[PDB]
């Protein structure tokens, strides 16, 4: 009376090694499998599945993959161990605070081990700390880490990556527009790979992200726990335009046999502060939609204030990101300014010594980019933090797993169990 | 999140079952402050217990109310017992014995 069926539609929650698929890059996209030109999406009918974006294994796996790719891209590049020395730094030739650039001279090792060369370089003030003699400096990372120059030819541009599960597994995309993030989601679908998820690292603002379709969406693991960040998703993007107006030519200094160090030389033009602009009339009423959706959770009588970052590292007090290959840190004190009962120029500071993933011992020297860098990105969300009659919502971030929870919230890996045993009125 | 804990003073004898009512609507924790030694965690969440804490302490959830049933009350329980849901802590009841 028992009957065995192979090919049954049954699945169980599971975790597997998802691989990549994609259509000189840090995230090794050339090595990815060629993705399907037309992805096959099978709308599953009548089926309800219980999702949980905050316990998603895809997010942790993507975090590990991004860190591993960053490590492997830095493996064959130059080691700037010699660059940690005392630097005689003057101010760059300027009238004007603006100590933001320092003209620093040092004795570098040449191709010959028994010779030395007097060279110079423009270093940002955030990349040099003062020792002692008042003109003597050193790179910020010398007393905590070893610095490895990023290869000038590998790009930091986020190329979309499609996370495909192996055969015998599947990914369940929840198509419900109003998705609180967890719980049961009707109208499930099966996909072979996730959508193109750009690996965009940033804090206080999700850039080049996927937008909600129906409404602004507020997603927090617990809206009562302050330690949990509040991921806000925008139904319409807010365009943000950057410029690094400095020309910033580069210059190769041979630090050893077959090892070059690309240093900033003279600036061709005016020494101007970098910035990114956000439209005022859009960012307002974007915060309008956000405060409506926050008052939904916090009651209608609350006063939803938006303050700027309380403190911490530079990576989380400012909207940090990578634009045109240079690492920007924008103030965003004017963005997060209102009580909520023409452009907004946000001044940004560039750094070259970057310690990604909150690590020590793996700092890197982004080489200077020639020309003039510009962003045209689209703010599709925020990472807020509530303060423990009124509720204040400061920015947050730093943990990049929250940056990829906003992308891998629909998806949910499952393991297809094809065997089934049912009673029927048949015998061998 | 709203909390309440009654009574404020409570005297009991040795070898007694004594309950401290404490109503809340969040993940609740129970502590033991010995007047100048910093609190100690006894019961985390409603009912779960901590290492180094004997079974003399125990907790029970019922809708919204929490008990902290301290059976076989020993002389070493002369402390102050307070609740905590996230950032909100109420004054603890001063066990007298």
């Amino acid at each position, epitope marked *: 009376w028992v009957t065995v069926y192979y090919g049954v539609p049954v699945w169980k929650d599971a975790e597997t090694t998802l691989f990549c698929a994609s259509d000189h890059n840090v995230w090794a996209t050339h090595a990815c499998v060629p993705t399907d030109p037309n992805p096959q999406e099978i709308h599953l009918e009548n089926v309800t599945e219980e999702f949980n974006m905050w316990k998603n294994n895809m997010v942790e796996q993507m975090h590990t993959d991004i860190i591993s790719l960053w490590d492997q891209s830095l493996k064959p590049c130059v080691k700037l161990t010699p660059l940690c020395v005392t630097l005689q730094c003057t101010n760059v030739t300027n009238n004007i605070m603006r100590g933001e650039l320092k003209n620093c001279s040092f004795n570098m090792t040449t191709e010959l081990r028994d010779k030395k060369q007097k060279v110079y370089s423009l270093f940002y003030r955030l990349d040099v700390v003062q020792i002692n003699s008042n003109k003597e400096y050193r790179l910020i990372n010398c007393n905590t880490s070893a610095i490895t120059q990023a290869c000038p030819k590998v790009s930091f541009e986020p190329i979309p990556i499609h996370y495909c599960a192996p055969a015998g597994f599947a990914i369940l995309k929840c198509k419900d527009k109003k998705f609180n993030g967890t719980g049961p989601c009707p109208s499930v679908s099966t996909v072979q790979c996730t959508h193109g998820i750009k690996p965009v690292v940033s804090t206080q603002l999700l850039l080049n992200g996927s937008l909600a379709e129906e409404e602004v969406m507020i997603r927090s693991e617990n809206i009562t726990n302050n330690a949990k960040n509040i991921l806000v998703q925008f139904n319409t993007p807010v365009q943000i335009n950057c410029t690094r107006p400095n020309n910033n030519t580069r210059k190769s200094i041979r630090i050893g046999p077959g090892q070059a160090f690309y240093a900033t030389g003279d600036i061709i033009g005016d020494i101007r502060q970098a910035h990114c602009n956000v439209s005022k009339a859009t960012w307002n009423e974007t915060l309008g939609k956000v405060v409506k959706q926050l008052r939904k959770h916090f009651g209608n009588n609350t006063i939803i204030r938006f303050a700027n970052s309380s403190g911490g590292d530079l990576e989380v007090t400012t909207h940090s990101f990578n634009c045109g290959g240079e690492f920007f840190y924008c103030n965003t004190s004017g963005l997060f300014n209102s009580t909520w009962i023409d452009s907004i120029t946000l001044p940004c500071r560039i750094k070259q010594i970057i310690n990604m993933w909150q690590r020590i011992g793996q700092a890197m020297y982004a080489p200077p980019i020639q020309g003039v860098i510009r962003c045209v990105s689209n703010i599709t969300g925020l990472i807020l933090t509530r303060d423990g009659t009124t509720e204040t919502f400061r920015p947050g971030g730093g943990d990049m797993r929250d940056n990829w929870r906003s992308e891998l919230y629909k998806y949910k890996v499952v393991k297809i169990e094809p065997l089934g045993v049912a009673p029927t009125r048949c015998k061998r | 999140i709203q909390m309440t804990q009654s009574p404020s003073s409570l005297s009991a004898s040795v070898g007694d079952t004594v309950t401290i009512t404490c109503q809340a609507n969040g993940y609740l924790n129970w502590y033991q402050q010995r007047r100048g030694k910093a609190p100690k965690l006894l019961i*985390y969440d409603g009912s779960k217990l901590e290492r180094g804490v004997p079974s003399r302490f125990s907790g029970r959830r019922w809708g919204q109310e929490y008990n902290l049933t301290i059976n076989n009350l020993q002389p070493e329980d002369i402390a102050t017992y307070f609740c*905590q849901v996230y950032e909100f802590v109420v004054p603890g009841t001063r066990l007298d014995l």
Partner: nanobody
Amino acid sequence: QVQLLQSGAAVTKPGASVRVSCEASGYNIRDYFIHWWRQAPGQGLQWVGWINPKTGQPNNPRQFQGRVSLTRHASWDFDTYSFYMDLKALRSDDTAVYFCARQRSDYWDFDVWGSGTQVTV
């Protein structure tokens, strides 16, 4: 073992500033927020605020905005982690014992606290 060694009791005057140190050791300090609380004389506990050990992002209530400053400092390889609590516009109201505790899960279980630091104004 898990240890939050606090600093000695300090005395200040109204207007001056006080610093309270919470040198932490014996575990992975990164995965667990450090919360600061304040026991007034003969009162309950009051929430001063948490600091993230990874990013350093502080979080204080409306009372201590622009007033308290939670900072950290990690030594080499993050093995030691000194957490500092600074106050600026100090008053006689703020005479209390400042404890530092380790939130150890989503339930806000403070299984370990500090010895305490009696700030008297």
